[PDB]
C-alpha cells in the first residue's frame, strides 16, 4: 500500500510539471488516498503523520485547483 502512495503521488506530480492535468488530478486524489490510508492503519510517530499530512494538503490543493481551472 505504501509503495502505491509514492508511486501514485510521484506520477501525479510528474504530470503537473509535464503539463497533464486530467490524469494528474485522478492520480493526486488516489495517491493521497493511500497516504492517509496507511496512516489510519499504521501510525508510528508524529513525524511520519506530519509529513504525509503536509504532503496531502499540497497535493490535494493542486487537485482542487486543476479541477476548477479545468472546468472554469
Amino acid at each position: 500500500n505504501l509503495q502505491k502512495a509514492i508511486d501514485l503521488a510521484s506520477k501525479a506530480a510528474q504530470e503537473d510539471k509535464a503539463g497533464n492535468y486530467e490524469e494528474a488530478l485522478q492520480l493526486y486524489q488516489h495517491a493521497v488516498q493511500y497516504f492517509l490510508h496507511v496512516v489510519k492503519y499504521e501510525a508510528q510517530g508524529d513525524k511520519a503523520k506530519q509529513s504525509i499530512r503536509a504532503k496531502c494538503t499540497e497535493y490535494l490543493d493542486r487537485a482542487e485547483k486543476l479541477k476548477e481551472y479545468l472546468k472554469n
Binding site: 492517509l36 494538503t57 490535494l60 482542487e64
Partner: peptide, 14 residues
C-alpha cells in the same frame, strides 16, 4: 488530520 482527511472525502465523492 481533520482538515486533510475531510479534503480527500470532499474531492473523492460521487
Amino acid at each position: 488530520d481533520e482538515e486533510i482527511e475531510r479534503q480527500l472525502k470532499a474531492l473523492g465523492v460521487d
